[PDB]
Amino acid sequence: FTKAYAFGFPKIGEKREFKKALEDFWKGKITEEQFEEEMNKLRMYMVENYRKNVDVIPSNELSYYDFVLDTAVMVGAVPERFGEYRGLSTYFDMARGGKALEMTKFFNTNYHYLVPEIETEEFYLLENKPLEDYLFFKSKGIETAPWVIGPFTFLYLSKRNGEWIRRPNQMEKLLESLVSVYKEVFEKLVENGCKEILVNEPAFVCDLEKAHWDLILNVYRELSEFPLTVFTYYDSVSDYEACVSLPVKRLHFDFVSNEENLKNLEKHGFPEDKKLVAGVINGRQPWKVDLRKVASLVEKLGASAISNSCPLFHLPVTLELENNLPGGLKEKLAFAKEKLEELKMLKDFLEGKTFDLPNVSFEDFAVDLQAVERVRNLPEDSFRREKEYTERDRIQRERLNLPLFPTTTIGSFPQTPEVRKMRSKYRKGEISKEEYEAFIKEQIKKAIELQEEIGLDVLVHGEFERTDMVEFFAEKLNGIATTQNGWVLSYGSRCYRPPIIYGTVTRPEPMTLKEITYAQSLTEKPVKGMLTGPVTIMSWSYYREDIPEREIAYQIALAINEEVKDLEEAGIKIVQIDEPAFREKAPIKKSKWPEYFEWAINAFNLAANARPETQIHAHMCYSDFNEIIEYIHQLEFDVISIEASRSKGEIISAFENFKGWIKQIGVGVWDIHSPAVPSINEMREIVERVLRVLPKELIWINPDCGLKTRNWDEVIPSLRNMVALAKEMREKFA
Ligand SMILES: CN1c2c(nc(N)[nH]c2=O)NC[C@@H]1CNc1ccc(C(=O)N[C@@H](CCC(=O)O)C(=O)O)cc1
Ligand SMILES: OC[C@@H](O)[C@@H](O)CO
Ligand SMILES: [Zn+2]
Numbered sequence: 001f002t003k004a005y006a007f008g009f010p011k012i013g014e015k016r017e018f019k020k021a022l023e024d025f026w027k028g029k030i031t032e033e034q035f036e037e038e039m040n041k042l043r044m045y046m047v048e049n050y051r052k053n054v055d056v057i058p059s060n061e062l063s064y065y066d067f068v069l070d071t072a073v074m075v076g077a078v079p080e081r082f083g084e085y086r087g088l089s090t091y092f093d094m095a096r097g098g099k100a101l102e103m104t105k106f107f108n109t110n111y112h113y114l115v116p117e118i119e120t121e122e123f124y125l126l127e128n129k130p131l132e133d134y135l136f137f138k139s140k141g142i143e144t145a146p147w148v149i150g151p152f153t154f155l156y157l158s159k160r161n162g163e164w165i166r167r168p169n170q171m172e173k174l175l176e177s178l179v180s181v182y183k184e185v186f187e188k189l190v191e192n193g194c195k196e197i198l199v200n201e202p203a204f205v206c207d208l209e210k211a212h213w214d215l216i217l218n219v220y221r222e223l224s225e226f227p228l229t230v231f232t233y234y235d236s237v238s239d240y241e242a243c244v245s246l247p248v249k250r251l252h253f254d255f256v257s258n259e260e261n262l263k264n265l266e267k268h269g270f271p272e273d274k275k276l277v278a279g280v281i282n283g284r285q286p287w288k289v290d291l292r293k294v295a296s297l298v299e300k301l302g303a304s305a306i307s308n309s310c311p312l313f314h315l316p317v318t319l320e321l322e323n324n325l326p327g328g329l330k331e332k333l334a335f336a337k338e339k340l341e342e343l344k345m346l347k348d349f350l351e352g353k354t355f356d357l358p359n360v361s362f363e364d365f366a367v368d369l370q371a372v373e374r375v376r377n378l379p380e381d382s383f384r385r386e387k388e389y390t391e392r393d394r395i396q397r398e399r400l401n402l403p404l405f406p407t408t409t410i411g412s413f414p415q416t417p418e419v420r421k422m423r424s425k426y427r428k429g430e431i432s433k434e435e436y437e438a439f440i441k442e443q444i445k446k447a448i449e450l451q452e453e454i455g456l457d458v459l460v461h462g463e464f465e466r467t468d469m470v471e472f473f474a475e476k477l478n479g480i481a482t483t484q485n486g487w488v489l490s491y492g493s494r495c496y497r498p499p500i501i502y503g504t505v506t507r508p509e510p511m512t513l514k515e516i517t518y519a520q521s522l523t524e525k526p527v528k529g530m531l532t533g534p535v536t537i538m539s540w541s542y543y544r545e546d547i548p549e550r551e552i553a554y555q556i557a558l559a560i561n562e563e564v565k566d567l568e569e570a571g572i573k574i575v576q577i578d579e580p581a582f583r584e585k586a587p588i589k590k591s592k593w594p595e596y597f598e599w600a601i602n603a604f605n606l607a608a609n610a611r612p613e614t615q616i617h618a619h620m621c622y623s624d625f626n627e628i629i630e631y632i633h634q635l636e637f638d639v640i641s642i643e644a645s646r647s648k649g650e651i652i653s654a655f656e657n658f659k660g661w662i663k664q665i666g667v668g669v670w671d672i673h674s675p676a677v678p679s680i681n682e683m684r685e686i687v688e689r690v691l692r693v694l695p696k697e698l699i700w701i702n703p704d705c706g707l708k709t710r711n712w713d714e715v716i717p718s719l720r721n722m723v724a725l726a727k728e729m730r731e732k733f734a
Helices: 018-027 031-049 067-074 090-096 129-140 151-157 170-193 212-220 240-244 260-268 289-303 338-350 367-378 389-400 417-427 433-454 513-520 536-541 551-567 590-607 650-656 680-690 711-731
Strands: 102-105 112-115 147-150 198-201 228-233 250-254 276-281 304-310 478-481 488-491 492-496 502-506 528-534 574-578 615-619 640-642 664-668 699-702
Touching: 018 031, 031 090, 031 338, 067 090, 067 112, 067 129, 067 151, 102 680, 112 289, 112 417, 129 147, 129 170, 147 170, 147 536, 151 240, 151 276, 170 212, 228 276, 228 367, 240 260, 276 338, 289 338, 304 338, 367 551, 367 711, 417 433, 433 513, 433 664, 433 711, 478 528, 488 590, 513 551, 528 551, 536 574, 536 590, 551 574, 551 590, 640 650, 640 699, 650 664, 650 680, 680 699, 680 711, 699 711
Parallel strands: 147 198, 198 228, 228 250, 250 276, 276 304, 528 574, 574 615, 615 640, 640 664, 664 699
Antiparallel strands: 102 112, 478 502, 488 492
C-alpha cells in the first residue's frame, strides 16, 4: 500500500466559475447565499477530483480570495481600521478596496497573497474555518484533511509596523500566543473526528538561521499531540537534520525543484520514527514525466507515501479540451487534473496493481539545431555594448538634444472601453484586421498629438495593441504556444493564461516595428521602442525542463535583440526593455542569488546589446534597490526609471551610496496606483530629494509606472503638472 496525497488543486473551476461568482457577487448580481451555493459546487468539484486519484482528501482549500488572509482571520489578525469582522463583507474589504491589505508575491511564484498586519501581540480563535469546511464534507460523508498555513510561515509572510517579522527575536513572543490558537483549532478538529491535518511551512525553505530552527522545534513540540503532516516546497529545506528531527509523525519534502533534499536524505538518512512523503510530481510545470523513473526514485527515497512536489494551483485545471495546440505538444503536456491522475498511476504501479506505464520520452521534440547552436557559440562580445557608458552618453545626448530634466512616460496608456471593445470584436472576428490596425493607428495618432500638446520630451505609442507585456510577444515567437483554457489564478478573481515554451525560441519576423515606425513618423520628438525582457517572458510562462534555464533565456534574449536591431535600422533612437522578472525570478534562497544573477544579467545585456547611439531605458518596479543594486549596476542600460513617489524620493538612497554611480535615473514622481492628481509641490519634493547628491543631469522626470489602469481625466492633469514642474526646475538650475 502506497498512500497518495495531493494539494493545491485549482479552485477556479473548468470555466472560471469561481471568477464569475466572485465578480457576480461584488456587482450585486447574486446573493451571498447564491454565492455560497456556487462555492459549494466548487468544493464538490475539487473533492471529487481528489477522491478519484489520491487517498487523502484536502479540505479548507477553497479560499474566497486568499489563504493567507484566511489564516489571518482565523487567528484574529484583523487591523483596527476594518472594525468588527462581520464576515464576507469585512473579508472582501481586507482583500480589495481602499482599506485593503497589501498585495505581494507568494514566494517565487506568480500567485499573490495578502500580507497580514499584526497590530496586537495576542491572537485568538476568531473563526475556525478549518473546522467548518471539515464538517461540511463530513455532511456529504467525506472524510477530509484540513489544509492550513503553518504558524512559522504565517508570521514569515506578515508584517508588524510595516516590517517583515522574519527575525527570531521578532517572532518568539508572537509565536507563543499564535501557537495557542492553532492548538485550539487542532483540538477542535480531533474532537470531531479529524484523523489528519496538512500543515504548510514553505518558509522552511528560506535561508534560515539555526536560531529559527530552535523556535520551530519549540512550536511543533507544543503541537506533537496532533495528527500533523508537514509540507515544504519550492526549494530544499534550509536544515535537513533539524527538520527531520521535528516531533511530527510524517514529513513532506519537495524532491522536484531542487536536488539538495535528495543529497541530504542520502547523506543523513531519514528517521525510522516518522514517515516520508515524497513530492515527486511537479506542480509548477506542465510536463508529462517518465513514471518509471519517478517510481524508482520513490523506492530509493524509501517512502511509502507520495504527492505533488508543490501546490497544483500554479497549473491550469485540465488539458482535456486543448485540441488546437501545435502538433505533438498535447501529448507531452499534463495540467492539474492530469497530475492528479499521474499520482494514481504511480500509486497503482508501486502497489503492483498495474505493470504498464506510458512512454513519454520527448527529446528531439521541437528543436531548432541552427538556432540552438547559434546561441551556444555566442562570443563574449555578445553581452557587452561596443562602448562604455560615458562614451555612449555623449553620443546619445548629442543625438537627442534633450533639455535638462526631460520628461517621459513609462509605457502603457489608459484603454477606454471603446478600444477595449474593439479588441473584443477583432478577437471574435467581428472586425477585419485591416480595420483593427487602422483603429490602433487612430488611437496612436491621437496619443502622439496629446503628448506634444502637454509638452512631453520623449513619447510612447501607448501600447493600445497590447493586453499583456508577455503574451503580446509570446504569440509572435516560434517555439512558444498559447492555450485556449489554460487559466491560472493570479490573485483575487484575476486569472492569467501563461504561454508554453515547448521548443527552441526564435523570432521569425518583426514584432513591434509597424507600431513604433508609425508613431515616430507622426512627430520629430523621439518615440520609445517598447520591449519585454527575456527573463520576464520566460518567468510568466511554462518552459522545458530538459535544458538549462539560462539557455532558454539566452534564446529569448537573441530574439529580442534582433527586434532591437530592426528598431535601430528603422530609426528609433530610444528603446526600453522592461524586465520585471529580474528580481522576481530570483531564487527564494538569497544564497543562490550569485549563480542566478550571473545568467540573468547576461540574458538582459544580450537582449539590450544595442549600438552606442541607441539609448537603452530600463524600468524597474521594485520598491527598494539596496539588495540588488550590485546586480543592477551590471545591466548595460543607459537610463533606469524607478518608482519614487511612495518613498518620496527616499528610494534613491541605494543609488546615492553606490560609489561610482553615473547612469541616468528616471524619477517617478506620481503614484499611478491612485486616482489622485499629485500637485506640482508634491512632485517637487521628490525631485529635490533625488538632487541632494546625484548630479542634476542624471535626472529624468516621469510617472511611477504604466497608466493602463488609470482614466484619461486623471492622466492629463498629472502629466501637465509633471511638465510644469519640469519647466520650473529647469529655470532654477538653468
Ligand atoms: C504574471 N503576472 C505578473 C505581472 N506583473 C508582474 N510584475 N509579475 C507577474 O508575475 N502582471 C501580469 C500577471 C499578474 N497580473 C494580472 C493582472 C490582471 C489580470 C487580469 O485582469 N486578467 C483578466 C484577463 C485579461 C485578458 O483578457 O487577458 C482576468 O479577468 O483573468 C491578470 C494578471
Ligand atoms: O524568501 C522568500 C520571501 O522573500 C518571499 O518571497 C516569500 O513570499
Ligand atoms: Zn513599474
